[PDB]
Amino acid sequence: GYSDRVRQITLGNSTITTQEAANAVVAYGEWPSYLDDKEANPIDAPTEPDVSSNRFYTLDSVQWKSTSRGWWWKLPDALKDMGMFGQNMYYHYLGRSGYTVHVQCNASKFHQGALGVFAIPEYVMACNTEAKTSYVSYVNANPGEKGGVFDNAYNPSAEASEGRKFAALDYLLGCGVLAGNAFVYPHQIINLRTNNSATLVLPYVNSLAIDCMAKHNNWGLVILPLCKLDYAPNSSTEIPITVTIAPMFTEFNGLRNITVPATQ
Amino acid sequence: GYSDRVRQITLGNSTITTQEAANAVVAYGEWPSYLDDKEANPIDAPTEPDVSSNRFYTLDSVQWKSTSRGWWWKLPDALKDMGMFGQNMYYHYLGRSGYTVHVQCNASKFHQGALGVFAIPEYVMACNTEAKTSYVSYVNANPGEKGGVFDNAYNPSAEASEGRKFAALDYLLGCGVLAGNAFVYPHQIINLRTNNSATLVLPYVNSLAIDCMAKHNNWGLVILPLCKLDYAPNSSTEIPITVTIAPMFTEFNGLRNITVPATQ
Amino acid sequence: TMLGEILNYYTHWTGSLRFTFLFCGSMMATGKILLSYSPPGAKPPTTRKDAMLGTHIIWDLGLQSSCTMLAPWISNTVYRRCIKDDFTEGGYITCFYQTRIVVPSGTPTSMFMLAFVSACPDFSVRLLRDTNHISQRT
Amino acid sequence: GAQVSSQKVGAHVNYTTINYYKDSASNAASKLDFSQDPSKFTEPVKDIMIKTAPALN
C-alpha cells in the first residue's frame, strides 16, 4: 500500500499531501534539531515559538513558460513577512531554523519538462556592475517572497549605481560555476512525466550555532528548468510553480524592539 | 538580612528591584499556571511563547497631583501593543495569561498620600448616556496603555452618540458600588510614608479555560488616591506613577492571520 | 445537511467537523488545491496568502480521489450555540488553487468537486429543542 | 424490589425506583444506553480500510 510517491507532511496547523512525489531529501543526511547546551553561544533563555512559526507558509506562485530561465529565493528572507515566524525573526537579534521545502508543479501526462530544485548553503551571487566588486544593495539581495529570476544574458550596468543587483546568469548559477554541477547541492528534480513535487528537509547550516537572520541568509533555493516546458497543443502555455516552506526547530535569542529593515 | 521591604522580580530578560515594598499579593492565594489537559478546551497544540512575551513591559507614566481622581487600565488591553506579547495575542483567536503587576511611586519622607491599587476581575464600567444602557464603543473600552482616568462628577451626554464612553465616577468605582468596598478585590496600598511600590501576582481568572483576548478583558487595574497627595513646599507638585506588567504562563490557540482592531 | 438538520434539534454543539472533498474531473486532470479553516476574530480570508496562515491542507489530485480537511474544535466556550451568534462564531472555511488544475487536449477544462460534512467522534450536542425546519398552518 | 442507580450529574448521587405496575409498558424511560456503532453507516465496506493506508490500492 505505502509508496515512495504518496506522502503527508504535517507541521503545526498545516498539512501537505502529494500523490506523485519521488521520495524526499534530507540535506546532508541530517534532520534539523534544537541547539544543544554543549554547542550553545548566546546565554539568554531562547524563544522557541514551536507551532506558531514552525508551519507551512505558501509563497506567491510563479509561472513556468517555455521561455523561463529560472527562479531563486533566499532563506530566511523569503519568510521574513510570514506570520509569527517573521515577527519572531525581527524581534530578535539572533535566530536559527531548519526547513521543510515543498515545491509544487503539476501538469499532465502530455506535458514535458524538468525542473532542478537545489538548496544551496551560502548562495552568494555576482553583482551587475564591472566598475565595482561585491556591489549589491540590501534591498536587491533580499526581495522576500517574490524572490528573483535568472536570465540567459549578462549585461552589466554602464554606471555602478545602476548595477547593484545580482547578475543571475543561469548557466553560471549566478555565481561563476557551471549549473550542471549544482547537483553537489541537496536537490530533487521535478520531471513532469514522473513527479509533481519536490521535498527537501534542511538542517540549519552555518559556521556558527546561531546568527543574525536579518543580515544573513543561510540557504538559497534555486529552481532551474533543465529541460524546457513543452506542450504540443500550445507551446506558449504556462503552468504554476508553487513554493511552500515550513521553518523547523526555530530558536531565537537577543530580544529587543522590532527590526524594521530599509525598503529603498 | 532579608526584608519584606526589599524584593527582586525577574521574568525573561527583565528585572525589577524595590527597596520599599510591603510584601506582595498573590490574588486569591493562587499563582498563575499553564492549562492542564483535564481542564483544556481547544484541541490544537498551543503556542507558549515563554520569555519572548512573559516579561516586564513598562507603560507610559501618569502624573499624580493633589487634584487627580485616579486611573484605570484593562488587561490584556493595556499590553496589546507590547512586543511579542501583542503579536502572539493578535495572531491567535484564543489566549490566556496571568500577570505580575508592579506599580511604582516614590516621593520623600516629607510627602504624604495613599494610593489604593486594585485588581478587579471582569471590571465592567457604566456608560455615559442615559438614553441607552450598556452603550460603550470598543475604542473607548479599549484605550490600551494610556488607560483612562476617573472623575468626581457624572455628566451623561445629551445625545446617545456622544456618551459611548465609561462614566468612570470615582466614589462608585465607575460601576455603581462604593469605592470603600474595593478592598474585597486583590489589592495593595502605596502609602508614601511606608512604601513606594505595589506588587500583585494574578492568576488567569475567567469562567472559561481560555478566551478571546481581543474581545474580553479579564482584569481591571484601578489606582485611586485614597488620601490626596500633599507636599507643604508646593501643593501643586506632581509625582509620577509608573505601571510595569509582565504576562505569565501565556498560552495561545487558534492561529490564523493577524487581528487588526478598529481604531475609530 | 444531515448534520445541520440534527443540530437544529439541539441548542448547543461541541467538537470537530470533517470536510471531505471528492474531485470529479477526468483522470487526466491534475491539480493542487488549498483547503483552509481560520478560527475567528480576524479579517475573513479572501486571498490564499491569508488563508494559508490558518489551519489548512494542500490536496494533491490523484488516484486517491478524496481529501479530508478538519475544522478542529477551537473555541472559547465549551459549547457553541446552534444559531447565528457572534459570541460563538466558528470562523471561516475557504479554498484556493495551490497551483492550478491542468488538463491535456481533448479533455474538459471545467469540472466539479463535491463537498461533504460530518461530525468527528469528539462531537456531541445538548439541550433538545424544536427545529425551525418544519411547520404547519393552523 | 427497589432499584438504586446513579443520577445524571448536575451543577455540583443515587436515586431509587420501584415499579408499581404489572406491565413493563407502564415503566418510566429506559436507562441511558450509550451503545453505538457508527461504522455500520459511516464505513459499511466489505474489506477493511486502514486510515493511514491508501483507500484504493
Binding site: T10, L11, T15 | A45 | - | P44, M49, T52, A55, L56
Partner: peptide, 27 residues
C-alpha cells in the same frame, strides 16, 4: 462513556496519508 478525547500529537513526514481517502467506496 464519553465522547472522544484528543491525544497529544506532533507533526509527520510520512508515507502514511490519513488525509486522503476515496469516498467512492461508500465510506
Amino acid at each position: 462513556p464519553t465522547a472522544q478525547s484528543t491525544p497529544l500529537t506532533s507533526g509527520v513526514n510520512s508515507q502514511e496519508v490519513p488525509a486522503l481517502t476515496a469516498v467512492e467506496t461508500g465510506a
